[PDB]
A paper describes a structure:
One such highly networked epitope associated with control is [name] (QASQEVKNW, [name]-1 p24gag residues 176-184). To explore the molecular underpinnings of differential cross-recognition of [name] and [name]_S3T restricted by the two HLAs, we next determined the crystal structures of [name]-B53, [name]_S3T-B53, [name]-B57 and [name]_S3T-B57.
We were successful in generating a [name]-B53-specific CTL clone by single-cell fluorescence-activated cell sorting (FACS) following peptide stimulation for 6 days. We sequenced the TCR and transduced the C3 TCR into TCR-null Jurkat cells which were generated with CRISPR-mediated genetic knockout of TCRα and TCRβ genes, allowing us to evaluate the specific binding of the C3 TCR with [name]-B53. However, one important observation revealed by the structure of C3-[name]-B53 is the mostly preconfigured conformation of the CDR loops of the C3 TCR for [name]-B53 binding. However, the rest of the CDR loops, even CDR3α (RMSD, 0.38 Å), remain essentially unchanged. Figure 6a–d shows that it is the internal hydrogen bonds within these loops that largely restrict their flexibility. Importantly, the structure of the [name]-B53 restricted C3 TCR and the trimolecular structure of C3 TCR complexed with [name]-B53 revealed a nearly rigid-body binding of TCR to pHLA. Notably, even the TCR CDR loops, aside from minor alterations in the CDR1α loop, do not change their conformation, which might endow the binding with an entropic advantage.
Author numbering:
A (entry chain B): 2 to 243
B (entry chain A): 1 to 203
The structure:
């Protein structure tokens, strides 16, 4: 019982068309689409009060929706523009009464660029703990650095031996711009994993940082010399040192 | 026409304090209010729903007050924890009422209490790239703020709190790296407001 949006991420060349899917199995009559921008909050695009009914929201230009059935409410991007780079949220509610609330989907991060040449996968490197930190605190911090990727469609995770860990981990909530004055700036993201010095001094312990990058599809054309930046996992590893 | 105002835009408080989130809105008559939480890069999770007929709505440490006459709403978070840090959105149902109108949100930061601050900067060893020296400003208390600094090749991340459960130990950390030559790693943080007794061991 929830709202599912697809896709989670999407990269579009300017002028391309694209449809964002939204479905719900809660028998909700009301559905609506929003776009979220930094410092803007959620802005309403289109809403539907039932099958076959559709009304414009606060910012309807550039989009159109359809409500053929109660469950589905797709958002169609007519001609992708850079100004439409945003996070899109689909929400549903049962009916008109104020006792009913809204349920949101996970959102779709959508980036529009003039040329796919701007899309870059991350370079991942794990940096090993310093001897000075181990000697001073008896703890060992590993740093994973993903740099040079565009867009900011990445998921970083730490894997110790075989297990994905969250204890002792913190990742930057937002990646930074390597060229902060540019719209198409490539990004950098870091994350830390701190363990005991004795755990790091075991040469049998295997540390793995991986970044899941959401890039191009295998149907998009690629005329560049480098490898096509498709969706992929870039990883970096380290073993303990006695 | 319809407007929803959330103040403050950004709030930073030490953990253990009670905090207040304000939300005001135009007009009256029939409506409901819905508070949401979203973490960076994820969706919206509904926290509370207050109808116009109600004045109070609670859930755990969350308390949601509604003053229909003044048009003010309030979200009380009692005994704030670092896990409460997120973006809080206030939304009002329009007059139809067929759609939900949102405020610009309040980004809440709840800083962890560092038991024994031991601020230091340590340089780490490379991996796949020559030079590209990375290092770590860590173990500083929550009052310390890190700056972006000025340099063509130097980058500094925001602060970041990790929690080692096996050790009951929290620690803040910010990361700095570069590919230049005149920049040793530790020189990125000296421009920012850093404690005087910070440990700067040479590698």
């Amino acid at each position: 019982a929830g709202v599912t949006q697809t896709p989670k991420f999407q990269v579009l060349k300017t002028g391309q068309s694209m449809t964002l899917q939204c479905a719900q199995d809660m028998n909700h009559e009301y559905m609506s689409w929003y776009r979220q921008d930094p410092g803007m909050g959620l802005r309403l695009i289109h809403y539907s009060v039932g099958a076959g009914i559709t009304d414009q929201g606060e910012v309807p230009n550039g989009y159109n929706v359809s409500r053929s059935t109660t469950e589905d409410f797709p958002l169609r991007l007519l001609s992708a523009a850079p100004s439409q780079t945003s996070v899109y949220f689909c929400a549903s509610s049962y009916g008109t009464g104020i006792n009913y609330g809204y349920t949101f989907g996970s959102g779709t991060r959508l980036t529009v660029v003039e040329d796919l040449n701007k899309v870059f996968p991350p370079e991942v490197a794990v940096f090993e703990p310093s001897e000075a930190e181990i000697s001073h605190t008896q703890k060992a911090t590993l740093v994973c650095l993903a740099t040079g990727f565009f867009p900011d469609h990445v998921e970083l995770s730490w894997w110790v031996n075989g297990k994905e860990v969250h204890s002792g981990v913190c990742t930057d909530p937002q990646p930074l711009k390597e060229q902060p004055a540019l719209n198409d700036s490539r990004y950098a993201l870091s994350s830390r994993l701190r363990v005991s010095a004795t755990f790091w001094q075991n040469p049998r312990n295997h540390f793995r940082c991986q970044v899941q990058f959401y890039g191009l599809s295998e149907n998009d054309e690629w005329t560049q010399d480098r490898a096509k930046p498709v969706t992929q996992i870039v990883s970096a590893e380290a073993w303990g040192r006695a | 026409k319809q407007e929803v105002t959330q103040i403050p835009a950004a709030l930073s408080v030490p953990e253990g304090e009670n905090l207040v989130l304000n939300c005001s809105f135009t007009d009256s008559a029939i409506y409901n209010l819905q508070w949401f939480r979203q973490d960076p890069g994820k969706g919206l999770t509904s926290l509370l729903l207050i109808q116009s007929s109600q004045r109070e709505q609670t859930s755990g440490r969350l308390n949601a007050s509604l003053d229909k006459s003044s048009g003010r709403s309030t979200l009380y978070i009692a005994a704030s924890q670092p896990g409460d840090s997120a973006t809080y959105l206030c939304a009002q149902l329009n007059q139809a009422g067929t759609a939900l109108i949102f405020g610009k949100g309040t980004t809440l930061s709840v800083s962890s209490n560092i038991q024994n601050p031991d601020p230091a900067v340590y340089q780490l060893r490379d991996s796949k790239s020559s030079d590209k020296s990375v290092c770590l400003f860590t173990d500083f208390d929550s009052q310390t703020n890190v700056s972006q600094s000025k340099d063509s090749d130097v980058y500094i991340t925001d602060k970041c709190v990790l929690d080692m459960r096996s050790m009951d130990f929290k620690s803040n950390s910010a990361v700095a790296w570069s590919n230049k030559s005149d920049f040793a790693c530790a020189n990125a943080f000296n421009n920012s407001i850093i404690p005087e007794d910070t440990f700067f061991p040479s590698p």
